[PDB]
PDB file of C-alpha atoms and ligand atoms in Angstrom:
ATOM      1  CA  UNK A   1     144.458  -7.121 164.891  1.00 48.45           C
ATOM      2  CA  UNK A   2     141.201  -6.155 166.563  1.00 47.63           C
ATOM      3  CA  UNK A   3     139.563  -9.368 167.697  1.00 46.98           C
ATOM      4  CA  UNK A   4     135.872  -9.731 168.529  1.00 45.46           C
ATOM      5  CA  UNK A   5     134.507 -12.412 170.858  1.00 42.97           C
ATOM      6  CA  UNK A   6     131.590 -13.901 168.948  1.00 41.81           C
ATOM      7  CA  UNK A   7     133.815 -16.884 168.387  1.00 43.05           C
ATOM      8  CA  UNK A   8     136.761 -18.148 170.489  1.00 42.63           C
ATOM      9  CA  UNK A   9     139.736 -15.828 170.117  1.00 41.84           C
ATOM     10  CA  UNK A  10     142.000 -18.283 168.278  1.00 40.49           C
ATOM     11  CA  UNK A  11     145.405 -17.025 167.071  1.00 41.63           C
ATOM     12  CA  UNK A  12     148.506 -18.642 165.619  1.00 36.09           C
ATOM     13  CA  UNK A  13     151.468 -18.913 167.984  1.00 33.82           C
ATOM     14  CA  UNK A  14     155.010 -19.550 166.788  1.00 31.90           C
ATOM     15  CA  UNK A  15     156.917 -21.560 169.417  1.00 30.43           C
ATOM     16  CA  UNK A  16     159.783 -23.798 169.086  1.00 29.05           C
ATOM     17  CA  UNK A  17     160.176 -24.184 165.414  1.00 28.71           C
ATOM     18  CA  UNK A  18     156.460 -24.828 165.081  1.00 24.05           C
ATOM     19  CA  UNK A  19     153.048 -23.246 164.668  1.00 22.07           C
ATOM     20  CA  UNK A  20     150.274 -23.960 167.192  1.00 24.02           C
ATOM     21  CA  UNK A  21     146.809 -22.459 167.478  1.00 24.00           C
ATOM     22  CA  UNK A  22     145.869 -21.124 170.885  1.00 23.73           C
ATOM     23  CA  UNK A  23     143.211 -19.088 172.557  1.00 25.11           C
ATOM     24  CA  UNK A  24     143.887 -15.540 173.708  1.00 25.58           C
ATOM     25  CA  UNK A  25     142.869 -16.033 177.369  1.00 25.12           C
ATOM     26  CA  UNK A  26     142.744 -12.937 179.524  1.00 24.46           C
ATOM     27  CA  UNK A  27     141.524 -15.158 182.387  1.00 25.91           C
ATOM     28  CA  UNK A  28     144.841 -17.036 182.374  1.00 25.42           C
ATOM     29  CA  UNK A  29     147.759 -15.673 184.398  1.00 25.69           C
ATOM     30  CA  UNK A  30     150.056 -18.045 182.590  1.00 26.75           C
ATOM     31  CA  UNK A  31     150.425 -19.565 179.134  1.00 28.31           C
ATOM     32  CA  UNK A  32     149.651 -23.284 179.077  1.00 24.71           C
ATOM     33  CA  UNK A  33     150.076 -25.543 176.074  1.00 22.54           C
ATOM     34  CA  UNK A  34     149.269 -29.190 175.399  1.00 22.66           C
ATOM     35  CA  UNK A  35     152.169 -31.628 175.072  1.00 20.46           C
ATOM     36  CA  UNK A  36     154.910 -30.469 172.745  1.00 15.74           C
ATOM     37  CA  UNK A  37     158.684 -30.482 172.375  1.00 11.18           C
ATOM     38  CA  UNK A  38     160.442 -27.486 173.984  1.00 12.83           C
ATOM     39  CA  UNK A  39     164.169 -27.146 174.368  1.00 10.49           C
ATOM     40  CA  UNK A  40     166.068 -27.003 177.623  1.00 11.01           C
ATOM     41  CA  UNK A  41     165.316 -27.764 181.220  1.00  6.21           C
ATOM     42  CA  UNK A  42     162.039 -27.589 183.092  1.00  3.59           C
ATOM     43  CA  UNK A  43     160.796 -27.221 186.668  1.00  4.27           C
ATOM     44  CA  UNK A  44     157.558 -28.378 188.306  1.00  2.00           C
ATOM     45  CA  UNK A  45     154.529 -26.190 188.914  1.00  2.00           C
ATOM     46  CA  UNK A  46     150.984 -26.715 190.100  1.00  2.00           C
ATOM     47  CA  UNK A  47     148.262 -24.537 188.615  1.00  2.00           C
ATOM     48  CA  UNK A  48     144.523 -24.398 189.239  1.00  2.77           C
ATOM     49  CA  UNK A  49     141.359 -23.724 187.332  1.00  3.79           C
ATOM     50  CA  UNK A  50     137.735 -24.777 187.164  1.00  3.49           C
ATOM     51  CA  UNK A  51     137.750 -28.468 187.897  1.00  2.39           C
ATOM     52  CA  UNK A  52     140.826 -28.150 190.227  1.00  2.23           C
ATOM     53  CA  UNK A  53     144.619 -28.276 190.087  1.00  3.00           C
ATOM     54  CA  UNK A  54     147.090 -29.771 187.647  1.00  5.48           C
ATOM     55  CA  UNK A  55     150.851 -30.246 187.615  1.00  6.38           C
ATOM     56  CA  UNK A  56     152.684 -28.832 184.562  1.00  9.91           C
ATOM     57  CA  UNK A  57     156.201 -28.536 183.146  1.00  7.04           C
ATOM     58  CA  UNK A  58     157.574 -25.005 183.439  1.00  9.72           C
ATOM     59  CA  UNK A  59     159.947 -23.882 180.713  1.00 12.42           C
ATOM     60  CA  UNK A  60     161.437 -20.414 181.163  1.00 12.39           C
ATOM     61  CA  UNK A  61     162.931 -17.960 178.612  1.00 12.80           C
ATOM     62  CA  UNK A  62     160.961 -19.401 175.707  1.00 12.21           C
ATOM     63  CA  UNK A  63     160.711 -17.121 172.611  1.00  9.00           C
ATOM     64  CA  UNK A  64     157.332 -16.804 170.983  1.00  6.22           C
ATOM     65  CA  UNK A  65     155.750 -14.804 168.172  1.00  6.54           C
ATOM     66  CA  UNK A  66     152.009 -14.151 167.947  1.00  5.39           C
ATOM     67  CA  UNK A  67     150.632 -12.662 164.756  1.00 10.83           C
ATOM     68  CA  UNK A  68     153.878 -10.896 163.929  1.00  9.55           C
ATOM     69  CA  UNK A  69     154.601  -9.761 167.495  1.00 10.19           C
ATOM     70  CA  UNK A  70     157.671 -11.248 169.230  1.00 11.09           C
ATOM     71  CA  UNK A  71     157.969 -11.914 172.972  1.00 10.14           C
ATOM     72  CA  UNK A  72     159.773 -14.121 175.461  1.00  8.06           C
ATOM     73  CA  UNK A  73     158.661 -15.676 178.765  1.00  8.63           C
ATOM     74  CA  UNK A  74     157.628 -18.781 180.655  1.00  6.45           C
ATOM     75  CA  UNK A  75     155.536 -21.442 178.948  1.00  2.06           C
ATOM     76  CA  UNK A  76     153.798 -24.267 180.876  1.00  2.00           C
ATOM     77  CA  UNK A  77     153.230 -27.674 179.306  1.00  2.00           C
ATOM     78  CA  UNK A  78     150.635 -30.105 180.666  1.00  2.00           C
ATOM     79  CA  UNK A  79     147.150 -31.628 180.284  1.00  2.00           C
ATOM     80  CA  UNK A  80     145.118 -28.546 179.386  1.00  2.00           C
ATOM     81  CA  UNK A  81     142.226 -29.301 177.037  1.00  3.02           C
ATOM     82  CA  UNK A  82     143.067 -26.135 175.162  1.00  3.28           C
ATOM     83  CA  UNK A  83     146.277 -24.258 174.244  1.00  2.41           C
ATOM     84  CA  UNK A  84     145.932 -20.909 176.031  1.00  2.00           C
ATOM     85  CA  UNK A  85     148.004 -17.745 175.829  1.00  3.81           C
ATOM     86  CA  UNK A  86     147.921 -16.036 179.215  1.00  5.34           C
ATOM     87  CA  UNK A  87     148.679 -12.586 180.479  1.00  7.20           C
ATOM     88  CA  UNK A  88     152.413 -13.168 180.908  1.00  5.69           C
ATOM     89  CA  UNK A  89     152.837 -13.097 177.119  1.00  4.78           C
ATOM     90  CA  UNK A  90     149.800 -10.943 176.127  1.00  5.59           C
ATOM     91  CA  UNK A  91     151.259  -7.970 177.902  1.00  2.62           C
ATOM     92  CA  UNK A  92     154.419  -8.255 175.847  1.00  2.17           C
ATOM     93  CA  UNK A  93     152.600  -7.986 172.491  1.00  2.25           C
ATOM     94  CA  UNK A  94     150.589  -4.991 173.695  1.00  2.31           C
ATOM     95  CA  UNK A  95     147.297  -6.797 173.860  1.00  3.89           C
ATOM     96  CA  UNK A  96     144.494  -4.951 175.589  1.00  2.00           C
ATOM     97  CA  UNK A  97     140.803  -5.275 176.203  1.00  2.00           C
ATOM     98  CA  UNK A  98     138.623  -2.406 174.987  1.00  2.00           C
ATOM     99  CA  UNK A  99     134.990  -1.390 175.114  1.00  2.00           C
TER     100      UNK A  99
ATOM    101  CA  UNK B   1     137.799   1.785 178.647  1.00  2.00           C
ATOM    102  CA  UNK B   2     141.096   0.194 177.784  1.00  2.00           C
ATOM    103  CA  UNK B   3     142.269  -2.487 180.164  1.00  2.00           C
ATOM    104  CA  UNK B   4     145.825  -3.821 180.088  1.00  2.00           C
ATOM    105  CA  UNK B   5     146.899  -7.183 181.364  1.00  2.00           C
ATOM    106  CA  UNK B   6     149.806  -6.501 183.734  1.00  2.00           C
ATOM    107  CA  UNK B   7     147.291  -7.426 186.419  1.00  2.00           C
ATOM    108  CA  UNK B   8     144.098  -9.471 186.200  1.00  2.00           C
ATOM    109  CA  UNK B   9     141.467  -7.521 184.237  1.00  2.00           C
ATOM    110  CA  UNK B  10     139.063  -7.285 187.135  1.00  2.00           C
ATOM    111  CA  UNK B  11     135.861  -5.235 186.762  1.00  2.81           C
ATOM    112  CA  UNK B  12     132.739  -4.901 188.814  1.00  4.24           C
ATOM    113  CA  UNK B  13     129.490  -6.436 187.531  1.00  5.76           C
ATOM    114  CA  UNK B  14     125.990  -5.496 188.835  1.00  8.43           C
ATOM    115  CA  UNK B  15     123.768  -8.550 188.791  1.00  8.40           C
ATOM    116  CA  UNK B  16     120.916  -9.801 190.923  1.00 11.05           C
ATOM    117  CA  UNK B  17     120.758  -6.263 192.427  1.00  8.65           C
ATOM    118  CA  UNK B  18     124.270  -6.586 193.843  1.00  8.99           C
ATOM    119  CA  UNK B  19     127.819  -5.624 192.932  1.00  8.86           C
ATOM    120  CA  UNK B  20     130.473  -8.233 192.419  1.00 11.69           C
ATOM    121  CA  UNK B  21     134.015  -8.146 191.076  1.00  7.77           C
ATOM    122  CA  UNK B  22     134.740 -10.602 188.245  1.00 10.80           C
ATOM    123  CA  UNK B  23     137.451 -11.399 185.783  1.00  9.66           C
ATOM    124  CA  UNK B  24     137.008 -10.444 182.081  1.00  8.14           C
ATOM    125  CA  UNK B  25     137.896 -13.827 180.650  1.00  7.33           C
ATOM    126  CA  UNK B  26     138.235 -14.072 176.891  1.00  7.04           C
ATOM    127  CA  UNK B  27     139.081 -17.797 177.151  1.00 11.17           C
ATOM    128  CA  UNK B  28     135.690 -18.527 178.841  1.00  9.48           C
ATOM    129  CA  UNK B  29     132.777 -19.336 176.503  1.00 13.43           C
ATOM    130  CA  UNK B  30     130.302 -18.781 179.323  1.00 14.03           C
ATOM    131  CA  UNK B  31     130.008 -16.595 182.399  1.00 12.71           C
ATOM    132  CA  UNK B  32     130.507 -18.466 185.677  1.00  8.98           C
ATOM    133  CA  UNK B  33     130.069 -16.938 189.130  1.00  9.45           C
ATOM    134  CA  UNK B  34     130.554 -18.155 192.682  1.00  9.22           C
ATOM    135  CA  UNK B  35     127.455 -19.040 194.654  1.00  9.09           C
ATOM    136  CA  UNK B  36     124.984 -16.186 194.980  1.00  8.43           C
ATOM    137  CA  UNK B  37     121.299 -15.524 194.690  1.00  9.13           C
ATOM    138  CA  UNK B  38     119.608 -15.119 191.348  1.00  7.53           C
ATOM    139  CA  UNK B  39     115.863 -15.128 190.736  1.00  7.46           C
ATOM    140  CA  UNK B  40     113.769 -17.565 188.713  1.00 11.67           C
ATOM    141  CA  UNK B  41     114.413 -21.142 187.648  1.00 12.73           C
ATOM    142  CA  UNK B  42     117.673 -22.820 186.705  1.00 11.14           C
ATOM    143  CA  UNK B  43     118.626 -25.872 184.566  1.00 10.57           C
ATOM    144  CA  UNK B  44     121.604 -28.210 184.849  1.00 11.80           C
ATOM    145  CA  UNK B  45     124.789 -27.787 182.844  1.00 10.61           C
ATOM    146  CA  UNK B  46     128.214 -29.387 182.778  1.00 12.62           C
ATOM    147  CA  UNK B  47     131.221 -27.279 181.748  1.00 11.24           C
ATOM    148  CA  UNK B  48     134.901 -28.080 181.567  1.00 14.50           C
ATOM    149  CA  UNK B  49     137.886 -26.176 182.824  1.00 12.24           C
ATOM    150  CA  UNK B  50     141.596 -26.830 182.918  1.00 13.16           C
ATOM    151  CA  UNK B  51     141.202 -29.321 185.779  1.00 10.84           C
ATOM    152  CA  UNK B  52     138.187 -31.364 184.673  1.00  8.95           C
ATOM    153  CA  UNK B  53     134.471 -30.926 184.559  1.00  8.76           C
ATOM    154  CA  UNK B  54     132.126 -29.334 187.104  1.00 10.76           C
ATOM    155  CA  UNK B  55     128.381 -29.153 187.598  1.00  9.97           C
ATOM    156  CA  UNK B  56     126.761 -25.710 187.431  1.00 10.26           C
ATOM    157  CA  UNK B  57     123.313 -24.139 187.593  1.00  8.36           C
ATOM    158  CA  UNK B  58     122.176 -22.344 184.446  1.00 10.70           C
ATOM    159  CA  UNK B  59     120.061 -19.164 184.837  1.00 10.37           C
ATOM    160  CA  UNK B  60     118.717 -17.636 181.587  1.00 11.68           C
ATOM    161  CA  UNK B  61     117.746 -14.066 180.717  1.00 11.75           C
ATOM    162  CA  UNK B  62     119.669 -12.436 183.534  1.00 12.54           C
ATOM    163  CA  UNK B  63     120.256  -8.700 183.175  1.00 14.21           C
ATOM    164  CA  UNK B  64     123.835  -7.570 183.880  1.00 16.75           C
ATOM    165  CA  UNK B  65     125.775  -4.288 183.801  1.00 15.36           C
ATOM    166  CA  UNK B  66     129.514  -3.772 183.289  1.00 18.16           C
ATOM    167  CA  UNK B  67     131.081  -0.235 183.240  1.00 18.86           C
ATOM    168  CA  UNK B  68     127.655   1.268 182.638  1.00 18.76           C
ATOM    169  CA  UNK B  69     127.225  -1.187 179.770  1.00 19.08           C
ATOM    170  CA  UNK B  70     124.057  -3.159 179.945  1.00 22.02           C
ATOM    171  CA  UNK B  71     123.380  -6.650 178.607  1.00 18.41           C
ATOM    172  CA  UNK B  72     121.395  -9.774 179.253  1.00 19.88           C
ATOM    173  CA  UNK B  73     122.263 -13.445 178.965  1.00 20.12           C
ATOM    174  CA  UNK B  74     122.880 -16.812 180.586  1.00 20.34           C
ATOM    175  CA  UNK B  75     124.786 -16.882 183.889  1.00 18.51           C
ATOM    176  CA  UNK B  76     126.214 -20.077 185.352  1.00 17.03           C
ATOM    177  CA  UNK B  77     126.490 -20.476 189.115  1.00 15.43           C
ATOM    178  CA  UNK B  78     128.867 -23.086 190.514  1.00 16.84           C
ATOM    179  CA  UNK B  79     132.105 -24.071 192.207  1.00 18.45           C
ATOM    180  CA  UNK B  80     134.495 -21.880 190.304  1.00 16.91           C
ATOM    181  CA  UNK B  81     137.545 -20.571 192.141  1.00 14.81           C
ATOM    182  CA  UNK B  82     137.068 -17.170 190.404  1.00 11.96           C
ATOM    183  CA  UNK B  83     134.044 -15.078 189.186  1.00 12.53           C
ATOM    184  CA  UNK B  84     134.532 -15.010 185.388  1.00 12.70           C
ATOM    185  CA  UNK B  85     132.779 -13.003 182.693  1.00 11.46           C
ATOM    186  CA  UNK B  86     132.810 -14.956 179.446  1.00 12.46           C
ATOM    187  CA  UNK B  87     132.311 -14.217 175.785  1.00 13.27           C
ATOM    188  CA  UNK B  88     128.536 -14.645 175.942  1.00  8.71           C
ATOM    189  CA  UNK B  89     128.334 -11.357 177.836  1.00  7.37           C
ATOM    190  CA  UNK B  90     131.516  -9.667 176.614  1.00  8.20           C
ATOM    191  CA  UNK B  91     130.231  -9.517 173.052  1.00  8.40           C
ATOM    192  CA  UNK B  92     127.104  -7.700 174.212  1.00  8.56           C
ATOM    193  CA  UNK B  93     129.119  -4.821 175.627  1.00 11.34           C
ATOM    194  CA  UNK B  94     131.318  -4.512 172.554  1.00 15.67           C
ATOM    195  CA  UNK B  95     134.472  -5.802 174.224  1.00 14.89           C
ATOM    196  CA  UNK B  96     137.337  -6.635 171.807  1.00 14.61           C
ATOM    197  CA  UNK B  97     141.018  -7.649 172.003  1.00 17.55           C
ATOM    198  CA  UNK B  98     143.479  -5.245 170.428  1.00 19.11           C
ATOM    199  CA  UNK B  99     147.209  -5.339 169.613  1.00 16.49           C
TER     200      UNK B  99
HETATM  201  C1  AB2 C   1     131.095 -23.107 179.085  1.00 16.64           C
HETATM  202  O1  AB2 C   1     131.983 -22.067 179.392  1.00 16.64           O
HETATM  203  C2  AB2 C   1     133.139 -22.028 180.149  1.00 16.64           C
HETATM  204  C3  AB2 C   1     133.616 -20.802 180.800  1.00 16.64           C
HETATM  205  C4  AB2 C   1     134.844 -20.859 181.551  1.00 16.64           C
HETATM  206  C5  AB2 C   1     135.577 -22.065 181.637  1.00 16.64           C
HETATM  207  S1  AB2 C   1     137.256 -22.091 182.291  1.00 16.64           S
HETATM  208  O2  AB2 C   1     137.622 -23.416 182.471  1.00 16.64           O
HETATM  209  O3  AB2 C   1     137.164 -21.405 183.523  1.00 16.64           O
HETATM  210  N1  AB2 C   1     138.261 -21.389 181.066  1.00 16.64           N
HETATM  211  C6  AB2 C   1     138.603 -21.899 179.732  1.00 16.64           C
HETATM  212  C7  AB2 C   1     139.991 -21.938 179.094  1.00 16.64           C
HETATM  213  C8  AB2 C   1     140.158 -23.008 178.009  1.00 16.64           C
HETATM  214  C9  AB2 C   1     140.261 -20.557 178.492  1.00 16.64           C
HETATM  215  C10 AB2 C   1     138.676 -20.027 181.333  1.00 16.64           C
HETATM  216  C11 AB2 C   1     139.873 -19.519 181.966  1.00 16.64           C
HETATM  217  O4  AB2 C   1     140.315 -18.217 181.771  1.00 16.64           O
HETATM  218  C12 AB2 C   1     140.258 -20.358 183.230  1.00 16.64           C
HETATM  219  C13 AB2 C   1     140.013 -19.133 184.207  1.00 16.64           C
HETATM  220  C14 AB2 C   1     139.848 -19.765 185.610  1.00 16.64           C
HETATM  221  C15 AB2 C   1     141.027 -19.967 186.402  1.00 16.64           C
HETATM  222  C16 AB2 C   1     140.898 -20.515 187.726  1.00 16.64           C
HETATM  223  C17 AB2 C   1     139.586 -20.902 188.135  1.00 16.64           C
HETATM  224  C18 AB2 C   1     138.407 -20.725 187.349  1.00 16.64           C
HETATM  225  C19 AB2 C   1     138.525 -20.130 186.040  1.00 16.64           C
HETATM  226  N2  AB2 C   1     141.637 -20.882 183.392  1.00 16.64           N
HETATM  227  C20 AB2 C   1     142.865 -20.286 183.354  1.00 16.64           C
HETATM  228  C21 AB2 C   1     143.794 -21.275 183.566  1.00 16.64           C
HETATM  229  C22 AB2 C   1     145.318 -21.147 183.650  1.00 16.64           C
HETATM  230  O5  AB2 C   1     145.892 -20.450 184.761  1.00 16.64           O
HETATM  231  C23 AB2 C   1     145.946 -21.009 186.083  1.00 16.64           C
HETATM  232  O6  AB2 C   1     145.484 -22.024 186.532  1.00 16.64           O
HETATM  233  N3  AB2 C   1     145.821 -19.956 186.806  1.00 16.64           N
HETATM  234  C24 AB2 C   1     145.921 -19.713 188.184  1.00 16.64           C
HETATM  235  C25 AB2 C   1     144.724 -18.740 188.135  1.00 16.64           C
HETATM  236  C26 AB2 C   1     144.152 -17.993 187.028  1.00 16.64           C
HETATM  237  C27 AB2 C   1     142.884 -17.346 187.139  1.00 16.64           C
HETATM  238  C28 AB2 C   1     142.114 -17.526 188.340  1.00 16.64           C
HETATM  239  C29 AB2 C   1     142.676 -18.318 189.427  1.00 16.64           C
HETATM  240  C30 AB2 C   1     143.957 -18.928 189.327  1.00 16.64           C
HETATM  241  C31 AB2 C   1     144.505 -20.211 189.971  1.00 16.64           C
HETATM  242  C32 AB2 C   1     145.986 -20.000 189.669  1.00 16.64           C
HETATM  243  O7  AB2 C   1     146.930 -20.919 190.233  1.00 16.64           O
HETATM  244  N4  AB2 C   1     143.088 -22.415 183.745  1.00 16.64           N
HETATM  245  N5  AB2 C   1     141.848 -22.194 183.594  1.00 16.64           N
HETATM  246  C33 AB2 C   1     135.056 -23.278 181.020  1.00 16.64           C
HETATM  247  C34 AB2 C   1     133.855 -23.252 180.250  1.00 16.64           C
HETATM  248 BR1   BR C   2     147.817 -33.502 186.939  1.00 16.88          BR
HETATM  249 BR1   BR C   3     156.968 -14.825 182.149  1.00 15.27          BR
HETATM  250 BR1   BR C   4     138.280 -26.330 175.749  1.00 17.11          BR
HETATM  251 BR1   BR C   5     151.327  -1.190 178.145  1.00 13.30          BR
HETATM  252 BR1   BR C   6     146.496  -9.477 189.838  1.00 14.80          BR
HETATM  253 BR1   BR C   7     125.840  -4.495 196.593  1.00 13.30          BR
HETATM  254 BR1   BR C   8     133.082  -9.523 194.931  1.00 13.51          BR
HETATM  255 BR1   BR C   9     132.773 -26.533 178.699  1.00 13.09          BR
HETATM  256 BR1   BR C  10     123.770 -16.087 176.458  1.00 11.15          BR
HETATM  257 BR1   BR C  11     118.907 -13.756 176.955  1.00 10.31          BR
HETATM  258 BR1   BR C  12     128.301  -1.932 172.093  1.00 12.14          BR
HETATM  259 BR1   BR C  13     130.756  -6.221 167.128  1.00  8.90          BR
END
């Protein structure tokens, strides 16, 4: 799709066997979701934003599908107030900014 | 232009008579910059990021330019770890997401 920014850029993200809504966030290096079930093992990571740092759970090799486009990559789980899709997965679906 | 996301989408912004680099940040509702001078009066605002809330200074009707593209809007100044350009200004320059 071509998405304008008058409203938050919400999309549907297929992950695990479930649908979540998340923001397309070009400001985010990484994808960070609120608490959810993901399969497999995880490792610790600290990430930082406005407000400061947080610790998250890092799950690697997680398949995802955004609006019909498939990808795979690392997904972080932790206390973010918003599900956000970051550049690590946006590149894989071909997402660009344009003006 | 078309900007991909293999790296941070950094672009220069002219504001307050100066040049600054900032991140095009489609997850940001508002534009938030690191401490700098801006003219006129400011009002208080509280915004929230991944790691809690911070206090910022709100400056209205600030002219800004991005890749030749001129706009005007509200600019927040505060303790952000990164200069970010948010949707309030991105819409004004016709910036969209595409995939
Ligand atoms: C009222 O308007 C607002 C405008 C911006 C913000 S935001 O909190 O800054 N935000 C909202 C989010 C729900 C989409 C935007 C966002 O892109 C921030 C960008 C940011 C990151 C770091 C400092 C300030 C702003 N964001 C992204 C992330 C997730 O990624 C990591 O933490 N990233 C790392 C990283 C990414 C960008 C810049 C610096 C760094 C620190 C690294 O370790 N968390 N918040 C809040 C309100
Ligand atoms: Br934490
Ligand atoms: Br990745
Ligand atoms: Br939020
Ligand atoms: Br590409
Ligand atoms: Br980078
Ligand atoms: Br300058
Ligand atoms: Br700069
Ligand atoms: Br906020
Ligand atoms: Br505005
Ligand atoms: Br204005
Ligand atoms: Br335009
Ligand atoms: Br438009």
